[PDB]
Structure formats: C-alpha cells, structure tokens
Design a binder for this molecule. Structure first.
Ligand code: JGD
Length: 281
C-alpha cells in the first residue's frame, strides 16, 4: 500500500532517490520528426519532444507536426493528448488538433504569465463579442460563457469549421491557482478540479481524448493524468492496493518523455491519489 510507502519515503526523505530511479528506468524512443529543422519553430523547448510512435499528426499535407503525444492507458480505458502550451504561431495548429481528434475538453494547468514570462499564447477569446479566426486552419472560436471560481475557471467555447460550417461545443477547464514555484500545499482544490472534468463527460470514451497542457506538457500535465488513471484503476481492480503509482508513471512515460518533472510533483501525485482514494472508498 502507497500510504505506507508515502510515510517510508517521507520519514526517510528519499523523494529525490525514488525520482532518480524513475528517471533511469524510463523509456527512450526516437523523436526524429520533432528535431527536423522545419519543425524548429513549432517547439517551445528544444529538450521536450514527442516520440515518433505516439505523436499526434495534423491532417494537413504541408507539415503534420505538433508537439503533442497520445497517452493510451489500456487497462484504465483512458486516453489523453498531452501537449505544450501553444505558441503564437501554433494556436491554429492546436485548434486543428482539437477539431481532428474530436476532443470535448481542454485542460489548462498554467497561467499565460508566470515568473514574469509568457508560458502560453492567449489561444481563446476574452469576450463573447470578440471571436478569434485562425486563417491558417480555417477555424472560428467563440466564447459562449465563462464561470470564474476561486481555484479554476470553466469556459464554454464554440469551435466552427469555416470549410464545412460544422460547430462543436468545447469545454475549457482552466486551473488558475497552481503556484509559480513548488506544488499546492493540499491536493483538495486539484481533486475538486479533476472531479469537475470527469463530471463534464470530457474523459469519456464517447469523445476523442481530452487535451491536457501546462507550459511543456510534462510536469503539471503529468500529475493530472497520473492521478486520474491511478484513481480509475483503484475503482476497477479487485484489490485497490495493487495499484503502484511508480509502475503507472513508467507506463505513461512510454508515450511522452519526462512526465512529472520534480520530486515535489511525484510527492504531490502520491498525496492526490492517497486523498482521492478516500472519496473513492
Ligand atoms: C520557438 N519559440 C519559443 C517561439 C516561436 C515564436 N514566437 C515565440 C517563441
């Protein structure tokens, strides 16, 4: 059981050591498409690349590349697209991916500005009456409504394919209170947020995979998927204590490098799953 393992690692202060064993055990696959010179301007960070085998392809004949990975968790029956916060030049690509993958939800775990730098382009409209048109990908995006709460905002968006005039409703789940440094002290508001995304239907197999991002699409984004998958496996298994968070993280790292960036994010993931297990038992 992980509550017991949590106390062992915490009382022995071994979090950096566990985190290093995960780093050394993690898969390494080619990411040749990400490193093509023509893709250089499509990557926010030169050391964060999708693997070729799990990368999302755009259906545009010109350049199919976006920094995004499909994480398929077979036992949990959950898929996720993890991507970087869009760049000024990739906002049209991002919405093209949402359209093509038939996603219902976008989960954003960062602020546009953190530590005095831009972590993400402003890729959604700020006002109902000022819609955004992405000329490169022929999409129109409208803010329909916005519900601002203390820890998160939920926005209803209409995405319109200008080529075919089809429209879809997209839900934007924006977690707004992750601190600039470190992790939240308590996982309560993060769990509430995760249950709100689940309640929306955005994580359900009827729809395409949810799109999850922070700045690089590996740290906070990693915590989100890891918590969700672990809690779902605890519902599904005869013995919930058979769920090993280190094994699940390693399985997810086959699909995208570097998921969970710090020993602090690993500790917070344990805490979120341990606390979430109480609401699930
Ligand atoms: C590659 N990169 C971080 C950028 C590209 C275009 N504008 C801003 C940043």
């Amino acid at each position: 059981e992980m509550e017991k393992e949590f106390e062992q690692i915490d009382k022995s202060g071994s979090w950096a050591a566990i985190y290093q064993d995960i780093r050394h055990e993690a898969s390494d696959f080619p990411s040749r498409v990400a490193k093509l010179p023509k893709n250089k301007n499509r990557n926010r960070y030169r050391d964060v690349s999708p693997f070729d085998h799990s990368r999302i392809k755009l259906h545009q004949e010109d350049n199919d590349y976006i920094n995004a990975s499909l994480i398929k968790m077979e036992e949990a029956q959950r898929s996720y697209i993890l991507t970087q916060g869009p760049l000024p030049n990739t906002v049209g690509h991002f919405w093209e991916m949402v359209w093509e993958q038939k996603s219902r939800g976008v989960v954003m775990l960062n602020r546009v500005m953190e530590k005095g730098s831009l972590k993400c382009a402003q890729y959604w409209p700020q006002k109902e009456e000022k819609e955004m048109i992405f000329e490169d990908t022929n999409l129109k995006l409208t803010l329909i409504s916005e519900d601002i709460k203390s820890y998160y905002t939920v926005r209803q968006l209409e995405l319109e394919n200008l080529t075919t005039q089809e429209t879809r409703e997209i839900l934007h789940f924006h977690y707004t209170t992750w601190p600039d440094f470190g992790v939240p002290e308590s996982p309560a508001s993060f769990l509430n947020f995760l249950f709100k995304v689940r309640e929306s239907g955005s994580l359900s197999p009827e729809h395409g995979p949810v799109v999850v991002h922070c700045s690089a699409g590996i740290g906070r984004s990693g915590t989100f998927c890891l918590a969700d998958t672990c809690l779902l496996l605890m519902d599904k298994r005869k013995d919930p204590s058979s769920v090993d968070i280190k094994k699940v993280l390693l399985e997810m790292r086959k699909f995208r490098m570097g998921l969970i960036q710090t020993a602090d994010q690993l500790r917070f993931s344990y805490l979120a799953v341990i606390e979430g297990a109480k609401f699930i038992m």
